[PDB]
Amino acid sequence: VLSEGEWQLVLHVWAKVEADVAGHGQDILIRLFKSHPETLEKFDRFKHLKTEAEMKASEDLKKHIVTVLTALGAILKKKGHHEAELKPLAQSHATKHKIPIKYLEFISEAIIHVLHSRHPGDFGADAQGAMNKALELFRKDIAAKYKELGYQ
């Protein structure tokens, strides 16, 4: 569903994220929790962080978000050939964290927002399109695994 050119744009933009994973991650979470405060309730520790500055000062949050974006980066670099990487993630997010697909849509929106904020010259319509397709492919495939595990 993505062309080789689309995957190159995805990966071009992701190399930029990789220059500061923690900083992009912090911004993505803050944007998620500002836009969709219900999502914060899924994080037993982070939900007690009262302000954007407390969130940026949390080493726990920073460590966590780097783990998250490392997993996302690994999946993107597979250019759709990501079943083996998705399987465990679907398993923990369906069975333990209980994350609905619409919250993966919310975080997808925050990713696009933060990448456009930081890298507008390397993130125009074609690049936004390709990342949107790549994040949609990730969610569709996670959604299929959710069903196989018996989660709604």
Contacting residues toward ligand HEM, per CB under 6 A: 39, 42-43, 64, 67-68, 71-72, 89, 92-93, 97, 99, 103-104, 107
Cβ nearer to ligand HEM, comparing 5 with 144: 144
Q: Which positions ≥6 away from 31 have C-beta within 8 Å?
A: 110, 113, 114
Cβ nearer to ligand HEM, comparing 5 with 54: 54
* Cα 95 from Cα 97, distance rounded (Å): 6
Residue nearest to ligand HEM (CB): 92
Count of CB atoms situated within 10 Å of the CB of 4 = 7
* Cα 17 from Cα 22, distance rounded (Å): 9
Cβ nearer to ligand HEM, comparing 3 with 92: 92
Closest approach of ligand HEM to the CB of residue 72, in Å: 4
